[PDB]
From Swiss-Prot, chain A:
Organ and tissue specificity: Widely expressed, with higher expression in skeletal muscle.
Gene Ontology molecular function terms on file: RNA polymerase II general transcription initiation factor activity; zinc ion binding
Official protein name in the record: General transcription factor IIH subunit 2
Domain VWFA per the UniProt entry, residue ranges: 53-229
CDD domains with a match to the protein in the record: vWA_transcription_factor_IIH_type
Membrane-spanning parts: none
Role of this protein: Component of the general transcription and DNA repair factor IIH (TFIIH) core complex, which is involved in general and transcription-coupled nucleotide excision repair (NER) of damaged DNA and, when complexed to CAK, in RNA transcription by RNA polymerase II. In NER, TFIIH acts by opening DNA around the lesion to allow the excision of the damaged oligonucleotide and its replacement by a new DNA fragment. In transcription, TFIIH has an essential role in transcription initiation.
GO cellular component, as recorded: core TFIIH complex portion of holo TFIIH complex; nuclear speck; nucleoplasm; nucleus; transcription factor TFIID complex; transcription factor TFIIH core complex; transcription factor TFIIH holo complex
Keywords for the protein's UniProt record, in alphabetical order: DNA damage, DNA repair, Host-virus interaction, Metal-binding, Nucleus, Phosphoprotein, Transcription, Transcription regulation, Zinc, Zinc-finger
SUPFAM superfamilies attached to this UniProt entry: Cysteine-rich domain, vWA-like
Swiss-Prot record, chain B:
Entire protein: shown range: 220 to 273 of 273
Subunit structure: Interacts with GPN1. Interacts with RPA1 and RPA2; the interaction is direct and associates XPA with the RPA complex. Interacts (via N-terminus) with CEP164 upon UV irradiation. Interacts with HERC2. During NER binds XPD/ERCC2 and XPB/ERCC3 of transcription factor IIH (TFIIH), bridging the 2 proteins.
Location(s) in or outside the cell: Nucleus
Listed name of the protein: DNA repair protein complementing XP-A cells
Role according to the record: Involved in DNA nucleotide excision repair (NER). Initiates repair by binding to damaged sites with various affinities, depending on the photoproduct and the transcriptional state of the region. Required for UV-induced CHEK1 phosphorylation and the recruitment of CEP164 to cyclobutane pyrimidine dimmers (CPD), sites of DNA damage after UV irradiation. During NER stimulates the 5'-3' helicase activity of XPD/ERCC2 and the DNA translocase activity of XPB/ERCC3.
Domain of life per record: Eukaryota
UniProtKB/Swiss-Prot annotation, chain C:
Function: Component of the general transcription and DNA repair factor IIH (TFIIH) core complex, which is involved in general and transcription-coupled nucleotide excision repair (NER) of damaged DNA and, when complexed to CAK, in RNA transcription by RNA polymerase II. In NER, TFIIH acts by opening DNA around the lesion to allow the excision of the damaged oligonucleotide and its replacement by a new DNA fragment. In transcription, TFIIH has an essential role in transcription initiation.
Annotated family: Belongs to the TFB5 family.
Record InterPro entries: TFB5-like_sf, TFIIH_TTDA/Tfb5
Record's signal peptide: none
Protein's organism: Homo sapiens (Human)
Keywords: Cytoplasm, Disease variant, DNA damage, DNA repair, Ichthyosis, Nucleus, Phosphoprotein, Transcription, Transcription regulation
Name of the protein described by the UniProt record: General transcription factor IIH subunit 5
Any GO BP: maturation of SSU-rRNA from tricistronic rRNA transcript (SSU-rRNA, 5.8S rRNA, LSU-rRNA)
Listed Pfam families: Tfb5
Localisation: Nucleus; Cytoplasm
Curated annotation (Swiss-Prot), chain E:
Activation and inhibition: ATPase activity is stimulated by TFIIH subunit p52 (GTF2H4). DNA translocase activity by this subunit in TFIIH is stimulated by XPA, ERCC5/XPG and XFP plus ERCC1; translocase activity is sensitive to triptolide which targets this enzyme.
Domain annotation Helicase C-terminal: ranges: 433-584
Gene that encodes it: ERCC3
Protein's recorded name: General transcription and DNA repair factor IIH helicase/translocase subunit XPB
Post-translational modification: Dephosphorylation reactivates the 5'-excision step. Phosphorylation has no effect on transcription or the 3'-5' helicase activity.
GO BP terms: apoptotic process; DNA repair; DNA topological change; embryonic organ development; hair cell differentiation; nucleotide-excision repair; positive regulation of apoptotic process; protein localization
Cross-referenced SUPFAM superfamilies: P-loop containing nucleoside triphosphate hydrolases
Gene3D superfamilies according to UniProt: P-loop containing nucleotide triphosphate hydrolases
Amino acid sequence: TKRWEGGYERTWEILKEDESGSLKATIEDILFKAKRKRVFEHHGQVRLGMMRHLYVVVDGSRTMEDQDLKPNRLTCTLKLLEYFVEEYFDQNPISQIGIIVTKSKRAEKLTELSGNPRKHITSLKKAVDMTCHGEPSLYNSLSIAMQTLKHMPGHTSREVLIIFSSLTTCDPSNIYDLIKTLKAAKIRVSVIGLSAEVRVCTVLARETGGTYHVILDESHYKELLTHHVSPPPASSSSECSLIRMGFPQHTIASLSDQDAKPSFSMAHLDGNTEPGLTLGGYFCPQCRAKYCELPVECKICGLTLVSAPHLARSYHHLFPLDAFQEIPLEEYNGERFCYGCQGELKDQHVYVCAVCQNVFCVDCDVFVHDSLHCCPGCIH
Amino acid sequence: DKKVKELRRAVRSSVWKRETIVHQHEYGPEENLEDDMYRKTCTMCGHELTYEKM
Amino acid sequence: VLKGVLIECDPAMKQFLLYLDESNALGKKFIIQDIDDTHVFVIAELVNVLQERVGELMDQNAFSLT
Amino acid sequence: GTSSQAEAARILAASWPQNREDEEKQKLASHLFPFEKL
Amino acid sequence: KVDEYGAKDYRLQMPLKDDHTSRPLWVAPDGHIFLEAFSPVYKYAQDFLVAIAEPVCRPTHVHEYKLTAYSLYAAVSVGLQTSDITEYLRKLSKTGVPDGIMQFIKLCTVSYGKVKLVLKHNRYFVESCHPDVIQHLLQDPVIRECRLRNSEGEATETVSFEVKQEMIEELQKRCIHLEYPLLAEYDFRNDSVNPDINIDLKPTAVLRPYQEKSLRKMFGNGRARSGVIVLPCGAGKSLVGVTAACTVRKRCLVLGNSAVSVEQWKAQFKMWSTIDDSQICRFTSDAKDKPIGCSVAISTYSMLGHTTKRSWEAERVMEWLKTQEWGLMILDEVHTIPAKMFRRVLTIVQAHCKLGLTATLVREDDKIVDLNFLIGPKLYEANWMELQNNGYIAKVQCAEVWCPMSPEFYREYVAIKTKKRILLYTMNPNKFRACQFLIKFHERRNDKIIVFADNVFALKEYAIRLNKPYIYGPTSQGERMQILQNFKHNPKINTIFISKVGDTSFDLPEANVLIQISSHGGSRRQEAQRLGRVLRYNAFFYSLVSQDTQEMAYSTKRQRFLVDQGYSFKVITKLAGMEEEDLAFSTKEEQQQLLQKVLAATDL
DNA sequence: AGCGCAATCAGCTGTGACTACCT
DNA sequence: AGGTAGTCACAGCTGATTGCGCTG
Ligand SMILES: [Zn+2]
Ligand SMILES: [Zn+2]
Ligand SMILES: [Zn+2]
């Protein structure tokens, strides 16, 4: 039988009257039921992650001049890559991005593997005006990525993302041997095609554990990149995976004190123009080297300079707040004022924390579970 | 008949050049009335233009 | 010298008034002097009939929803 | 012609709904179309 | 009743106030329902009002409905009874139901199931449970012509008699006047006389919840009845027909307006019904895919109602087709049913259930009311605003931008009146510049543009000036197909011109920009159809009119259907950057030269 | 220079509004 | 002084004619 060939639904039978006017009570119940439309979690997916050393390979062949994506594939690809780099560094604190451009059967390492987003964005903007010629070489790009990532620590997840526009690749040697070597090296390879499905990309993605997708339009391209942003699930505990990193305090210099010492920034020292000789900035806790941008690994002593708030922003996932016990107002024989907003409790349901047994209204409960991520009573 | 009709109007439509009629008022000699009034009568459409001359 | 009311309007309405002058829709040639592409000189004794005609033209191609 | 362009632009761009809206402006994004936002 | 301010005041008629503002509803004595959308019970009130009344306007804040006899017939067709509808109407009134609505509802809903019309063995019989009503209608002279051979009485069991097949429309027209409306209920669950086919829709064609409501209202209590479902072109309309055909599980007949809609319906059936091509046939005198002995037959109008000599193969196909019963004769583009030759199409074939599908039910000559008895009551009317709120219908930003008439054109417009002024405001140089600017701006951002333009004489010089493809309309079959095919999957060309050809349901690809110039007079149907070619601010459609011309009144009176649907037409007076770039007719010389060619028609 | 597919014209009809004549 | 059937524009369909192509 069919669902719609039976009896027609009467959704208006829910409302009923006993005292001629209880519709106000019904609409109050409906308004209360309208709230709490979430699961008390902003993400609700992967609550953790792992250090990812991701390499992004961009096709630089003549096929990038095609106008499937306005204005051409290269410009849309680089714009979406800038967006992807920004989002990936936003959602991954201690990750690194490398960019490889393959052209004329050779692969050029456009950018070193590091955690600076500004350098990658500047490199992409510079590469916007590149010359699209020749044919891509997946073998050379994968060889460069494997050579770079072979010496990386085992606990980090090694990933390669390939943007393959051209349907043909030139390999100076057998590629399936390289795929076997990558599989033995536990390097994940993901490919996002632009024209159509290529067998070698499917085999590579299946064997290395990655995913192979083909772009339908620019929105689908952005969706695939956004999916690639998310970190992979992390095993319980592998080994002593740790890392020596510093937390450079942003100590600026004021001439009101006698210790106002101007210093050139190491990052700005490599620029053609005059480096910024500002009063202060981020001083390395180990060698007192000065940097302006974070997170940037120290050039001198090799220490990783990260920002503590960036690491702390993900701490609420480790310790989620347990849902408060929903209690009807009549059954709660205690105070009738919310502990968070001091407002009078007039809702039919009152939420009580399991730890401190305090009183929270619906709005304060939603705010605590969604945004605050901490019980105000438990803090005291 | 159709193939001669579709071409007989090509030359007919290209003969006429001006459609709007020129309506310039060509007033004749002025007539002097009382109180220094002067009236001009159009010789093409009979338009009367009465004016006071300083 | 001429005495009357100067009318300032869009060029389309100036052409409409010029057409009304020659069409004798008012009974006479009271649209006497044209001075500018957007300005005309009209006798003041029957400025109301021009208002009525313009209003009729305006609400003719309006389709009031009443 | 040089003057013909100016005359035609003056006639077309400001015929009915400009000789009064501009006067009001002198005396005084969601719903805007894409060509009106550039 | 009183006209102190010219308004019908009914303050004293409905003074009941138990709850101040609990009930989001208003009633009127004659008949009308006002609904408050900003209410927590909005969905329940909408579900109640859709099943009992048809809408008249659905703006963003206060929905307004109307109570009609056919709406109450449809409501009582479903399991809803008089007591339930009355008690739930008084449940949400906030003012008290006037004692002019209760009596009207009682009178309408009491006489619904008294008279039935049934089809059996290619014979039409009218059966009534109450024997008295037969004698009550026996005295009607018009009914006596239907009964052939003295109608001895057909004593069975319940009193019924035969009626003439070719005069079924007349008796349906008379019955509503006799306060005894006829119903067309087909209980396809238990027939055992019809060779039910093995059609079965694939379990991968998911449908939206709004289509679920329409389908459920179609089969209220396990039976299928004739009705009309109104869904937008971008929305799923053919899917509803395919699902209904699969559920009825009988010999289906599909009727279209054009000879290209039959291929569209065949493709839809092949996509969402899992039917072999042997059973599927197209009857449009183009391929002749053996329509004899078929499960689902797809044909078109203007062929089943020929008044002239018919082809031998077509004559044999019609002879075969007029000799068996049909289950769920689907009619597409139901708005053009009340025609001189299309009304007889329903009476020339015999079918149990008649389903009408359309997107624009509006029509002039007030013949839509005739469709209430020609087919059935308006079953479903989609709420376009809430449909585009769900994101499944493109949120089109409607624009009504007018262009002033040039002085060289307005003199000729006001000088002539004998139908020669159509080309004057159509070929307005300012409107030409506006259209060119819009085309260029939306091409600079890679937007697909469909430019509708009636009065193909103007379109000829409108399209060659921009050097863009156009469809004159009687060009060919192949050229139009290839142009529409290369319009979508080609970045070089993304704008086409259509002349009254796209004023129906075709397979036009997804488009974002529609620019119509010089449409028909006051056809709300044409404007609604043209809007439907865009939805599928994701998109926006423009209408260009010439000020101080009849096109202004035409545009005003042709948008009242869309504003009732909830669309707002913003008025655009100035186009930004009009003088920034170069446009055609820049100087007065070519503008005044255009007068010579636009006056050169002289079709006298 | 015999068949056969395809382009083409005739006849009827739908949609919408404009217009001449007379009780 | 007022209203309905011709009539024009533009599109559709089906029913025939009638005119160009038809093998390594
Ligand atoms: Zn350091
Ligand atoms: Zn609170
Ligand atoms: Zn707590």
